[PDB]
Scaffold this active site. Sequence first.
Site, PDB file in Angstrom:
ATOM      1  N   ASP A 146       1.015  -1.071  -0.078  1.00  0.00           N
ATOM      2  CA  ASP A 146      -0.115  -0.236   0.094  1.00  0.00           C
ATOM      3  C   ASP A 146       0.930   1.161  -0.130  1.00  0.00           C
ATOM      4  O   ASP A 146       0.764   2.114   0.839  1.00  0.00           O
ATOM      5  CB  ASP A 146      -1.024  -0.018   1.155  1.00  0.00           C
ATOM      6  CG  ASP A 146      -1.852  -1.346   1.348  1.00  0.00           C
ATOM      7  OD1 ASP A 146      -2.491  -1.545   0.208  1.00  0.00           O
ATOM      8  OD2 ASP A 146      -1.891  -1.703   2.533  1.00  0.00           O
TER       9      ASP A 146
ATOM     10  N   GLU B 243     -11.418   0.800  -3.515  1.00  0.00           N
ATOM     11  CA  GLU B 243     -10.384   1.274  -2.138  1.00  0.00           C
ATOM     12  C   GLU B 243      -9.392   2.006  -3.005  1.00  0.00           C
ATOM     13  O   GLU B 243      -9.103   2.061  -4.258  1.00  0.00           O
ATOM     14  CB  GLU B 243     -10.251   0.093  -1.319  1.00  0.00           C
ATOM     15  CG  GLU B 243      -9.190  -1.054  -1.795  1.00  0.00           C
ATOM     16  CD  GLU B 243      -9.017  -2.375  -1.187  1.00  0.00           C
ATOM     17  OE1 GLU B 243      -8.337  -3.184  -1.704  1.00  0.00           O
ATOM     18  OE2 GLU B 243      -9.598  -2.431  -0.176  1.00  0.00           O
TER      19      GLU B 243
HETATM   20  O1  LIG Z   1     -11.840  -4.509   2.786  1.00  0.00           O
HETATM   21  C1  LIG Z   1     -11.141  -5.543   1.592  1.00  0.00           C
HETATM   22  C2  LIG Z   1     -11.461  -6.843   1.833  1.00  0.00           C
HETATM   23  O2  LIG Z   1     -12.844  -6.880   1.728  1.00  0.00           O
HETATM   24  C3  LIG Z   1     -10.713  -7.591   0.824  1.00  0.00           C
HETATM   25  O3  LIG Z   1     -11.137  -8.878   0.938  1.00  0.00           O
HETATM   26  C4  LIG Z   1     -10.937  -9.963  -0.118  1.00  0.00           C
HETATM   27  C5  LIG Z   1     -12.234 -10.180  -0.759  1.00  0.00           C
HETATM   28  O4  LIG Z   1     -11.960 -11.202  -1.662  1.00  0.00           O
HETATM   29  C6  LIG Z   1     -11.199 -12.356  -1.164  1.00  0.00           C
HETATM   30  O5  LIG Z   1     -11.078 -13.338  -2.278  1.00  0.00           O
HETATM   31  C7  LIG Z   1     -12.291 -13.951  -2.684  1.00  0.00           C
HETATM   32  C8  LIG Z   1     -12.462 -15.538  -2.099  1.00  0.00           C
HETATM   33  O6  LIG Z   1     -13.429 -16.211  -2.737  1.00  0.00           O
HETATM   34  C9  LIG Z   1     -13.105 -16.392  -3.979  1.00  0.00           C
HETATM   35  O7  LIG Z   1     -14.184 -17.260  -4.606  1.00  0.00           O
HETATM   36  C10 LIG Z   1     -13.199 -15.061  -4.674  1.00  0.00           C
HETATM   37  O8  LIG Z   1     -13.356 -15.285  -6.234  1.00  0.00           O
HETATM   38  C11 LIG Z   1     -12.202 -14.051  -4.420  1.00  0.00           C
HETATM   39  O9  LIG Z   1     -12.490 -12.794  -5.034  1.00  0.00           O
HETATM   40  C12 LIG Z   1      -9.903 -12.045  -0.697  1.00  0.00           C
HETATM   41  O10 LIG Z   1      -9.457 -13.275  -0.288  1.00  0.00           O
HETATM   42  C13 LIG Z   1     -10.078 -11.066   0.443  1.00  0.00           C
HETATM   43  O11 LIG Z   1      -8.502 -10.390   0.629  1.00  0.00           O
HETATM   44  O12 LIG Z   1      -9.165  -7.339   0.913  1.00  0.00           O
HETATM   45  C14 LIG Z   1      -8.719  -6.305   0.861  1.00  0.00           C
HETATM   46  C15 LIG Z   1      -9.489  -5.288   1.840  1.00  0.00           C
HETATM   47  O13 LIG Z   1      -8.899  -4.018   1.982  1.00  0.00           O
HETATM   48  O1  LIG Z   2      -5.810  -0.643   3.352  1.00  0.00           O
HETATM   49  C1  LIG Z   2      -5.304  -1.509   2.608  1.00  0.00           C
HETATM   50  C2  LIG Z   2      -6.325  -2.025   1.480  1.00  0.00           C
HETATM   51  O2  LIG Z   2      -6.416  -1.110   0.588  1.00  0.00           O
HETATM   52  C3  LIG Z   2      -5.686  -3.467   0.821  1.00  0.00           C
HETATM   53  O3  LIG Z   2      -4.684  -3.262  -0.042  1.00  0.00           O
HETATM   54  C4  LIG Z   2      -5.721  -4.501   2.065  1.00  0.00           C
HETATM   55  O4  LIG Z   2      -4.625  -3.881   2.763  1.00  0.00           O
HETATM   56  C5  LIG Z   2      -4.954  -2.739   3.613  1.00  0.00           C
HETATM   57  O5  LIG Z   2      -3.894  -2.026   4.276  1.00  0.00           O
HETATM   58 CA   LIG Z   3      -3.180   4.605  -0.428  1.00  0.00          CA
END
Ligand SMILES: O[C@@H]1[C@@H](O)[C@H](O[C@@H]2CO[C@@H](O[C@@H]3CO[C@@H](O)[C@H](O)[C@H]3O)[C@H](O)[C@H]2O)OC[C@H]1O
Ligand SMILES: O[C@@H]1[C@@H](O)[C@@H](O)CO[C@H]1O
Ligand SMILES: [Ca+2]
Length: 330
Positions: free
Chosen positions: A18, A229
């Site tokens: 990030d 995000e």
């Molecule tokens: O706030 C953010 C979180 O919401 C974000 O979460 C991710 C959401 O997707 C996850 O991966 C999924 C797992 O299931 C599969 O079938 C899907 O195709 C995928 O998209 C992932 O593991 C999470 O990290 O993470 C970042 C945060 O900022």
């Molecule tokens: O805030 C970030 C988010 O944007 C994603 O990258 C997950 O890691 C966090 O630190």
């Molecule tokens: Ca940033």
Amino acid sequence: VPRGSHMEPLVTHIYTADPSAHVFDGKVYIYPSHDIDAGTPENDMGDHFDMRDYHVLSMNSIPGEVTDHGVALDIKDIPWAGRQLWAPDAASKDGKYYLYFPAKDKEDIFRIGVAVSDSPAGPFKPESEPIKGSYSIDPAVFKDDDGKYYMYFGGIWGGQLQRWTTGEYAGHDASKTDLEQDDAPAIGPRIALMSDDMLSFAEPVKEISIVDEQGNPILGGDHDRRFFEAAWMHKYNGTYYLSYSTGDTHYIVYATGDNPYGPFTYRGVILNPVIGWTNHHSIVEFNGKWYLFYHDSSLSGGKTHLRCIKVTELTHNADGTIETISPYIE
Ligand SMILES: O[C@@H]1[C@@H](O)[C@H](O[C@@H]2CO[C@@H](O[C@@H]3CO[C@@H](O)[C@H](O)[C@H]3O)[C@H](O)[C@H]2O)OC[C@H]1O
Ligand SMILES: O[C@@H]1[C@@H](O)[C@@H](O)CO[C@H]1O
Ligand SMILES: [Ca+2]
Ligand code: NA
């Protein structure tokens, strides 16, 4: 040893994510998250991102030796914070330096706080409470040419932005994703003018409108283009560039406007998908070149929560368009 010449990891001794890059005192200072292998449960609310401190990095040149300045802020010393030190940013005003950071408070609600130093390298003393009227994640504090500073912020899904439509938190049983109305405009990121003292907002928080080329709002169902995000603001040739991550579609995209508040017109992709789920960046001018700082999960062998920051040159065209970067070509 010098680093940053062929999209290799900038540091390998810790995991970093990030990256927010700035030019302060003629050097590049980078404010990334410090990823750790916490082993916490993995889920769509992001509990697997369980970071606990920030390290400031710096470079005198790109490529260049990267200095790790140690622990700039530790969650144990942030009085209001419960857990999760997510993507930070910094700003400089009148010889003070401000670290802006998202963390969950003791009610498990993301807020954004500030910590203060006399050096771009920290360490930083956190304010006792988060910024009043802040919420969600991923601050970017942008200094416009007129000397006004603006915080851009927000993240959906685990970032909780979708729970904030009334100016009060909707609760832990509210939407885990978005508005759940795909034919309505997508949720937009947030902006507020900063106070003169950089500790608070100077106005009620505003939502930013992002539109397509025809002027129609980007819709909730348009996951390729809609805000998820990692908001970032930069200016080039009089135009304001709102860039951001699309999350589940894994792009950094950009949209252009004529003022800090937008609306911004979707233009295209900055960065194609990387190794690992998240994609998070910053865009900065240094010695008259533009750079994209970003991350991936290459160093960890593909673990989404163990990332490493990288840098590459970014090319604006004189018509204001930006050449799309694909991370693993060349
Ligand atoms: O706030 C953010 C979180 O919401 C974000 O979460 C991710 C959401 O997707 C996850 O991966 C999924 C797992 O299931 C599969 O079938 C899907 O195709 C995928 O998209 C992932 O593991 C999470 O990290 O993470 C970042 C945060 O900022
Ligand atoms: O805030 C970030 C988010 O944007 C994603 O990258 C997950 O890691 C966090 O630190
Ligand atoms: Ca940033
Ligand atoms: Na493009």
